[PDB]
């Protein structure tokens, strides 16, 4: 069901209930709970963290994630493994830092190219976007949070994709990332419990700017 492999080499499947979560720009994450069995024994007693999970959603959606948390509980004469995991197109960014302090004016392609140095992944902007200046680089910081700042300045949203090619992850940067979807919803047909919340405690009609 779920093909997991060490960071070096071969795969091994396990059946387990999964709980995935995906946001637009924020990190996706999943969680699941393996249990000891006559099966799964060779794996469960031999998982070390940063085990590489993949083949969620079957023989498709080969979005390879990595485990970082590992719980191990004892239930009866058996044992559970709750665990968590994160994307490689995000973790692989949390891998590397930049020490050269980016500073001054910066066009978007230059900025999101210096940060994709050695990672191998690829970025591209769709529409024309302006440029601004970044005051202090994150010399002691991830590529990820500088990516956050860059999105906050220039590309207000993004969307990753595992392109057809191996070891590639195209970052379509875009303001207000969207694609049309043929499906739909309604209270009768697909929407059990509609909680509409309208929060306005920090809201505005006119506003000043300097």
């Amino acid at each position: 069901t779920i093909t997991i492999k060490p960071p070096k080499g071969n795969g091994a499947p396990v059946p387990v209930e999964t709980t995935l979560v995906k946001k637009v720009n924020a990190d996706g994450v999943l969680t699941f709970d393996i249990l000891e069995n006559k099966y799964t024994y060779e794996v469960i007693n031999a998982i070390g963290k940063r085990w590489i999970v993949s083949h969620v959603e079957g023989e498709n959606d080969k979005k390879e994630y990595v485990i970082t948390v590992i719980d191990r509980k004892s239930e009866g004469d058996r044992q559970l493994v709750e665990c968590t995991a994160r994307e490689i197109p995000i973790d692989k960014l949390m891998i590397d830092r930049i020490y050269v302090n980016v500073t001054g004016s910066f066009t978007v392609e230059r900025y999101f190219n210096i940060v994709f140095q050695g990672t191998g992944m690829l970025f591209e902007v769709e529409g024309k976007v302006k440029s601004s200046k970044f005051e202090n680089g994150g010399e002691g910081d991830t590529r990820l949070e500088m990516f956050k700042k860059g999105l906050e300045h220039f590309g207000l949203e993004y969307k990753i994709t595992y392109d057809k090619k191996k070891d590639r992850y195209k970052f379509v940067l875009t303001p207000f990332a969207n694609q049309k979807a043929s499906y739909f919803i309604s209270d009768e047909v697909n929407a059990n419990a509609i909680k509409l919340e309208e929060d306005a405690s920090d809201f505005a009609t006119f506003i000043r700017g300097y």
């Binding site: 720009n25 924020a26 990190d27 996706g28 994450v29 970082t68 948390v69 968590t84 994160r86 995000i90 990820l144 949070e145 990516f147 956050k148 999105l151």
Partner: peptide
């Protein structure tokens, strides 16, 4: 009394992978 721990534990779980 028994209850604070479960919620705080799930909270600390959620502290993993909440941030870009």
């Amino acid at each position: 009394d028994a209850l604070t721990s479960i919620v705080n534990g799930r909270n600390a779980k959620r502290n993993s992978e909440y941030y870009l």
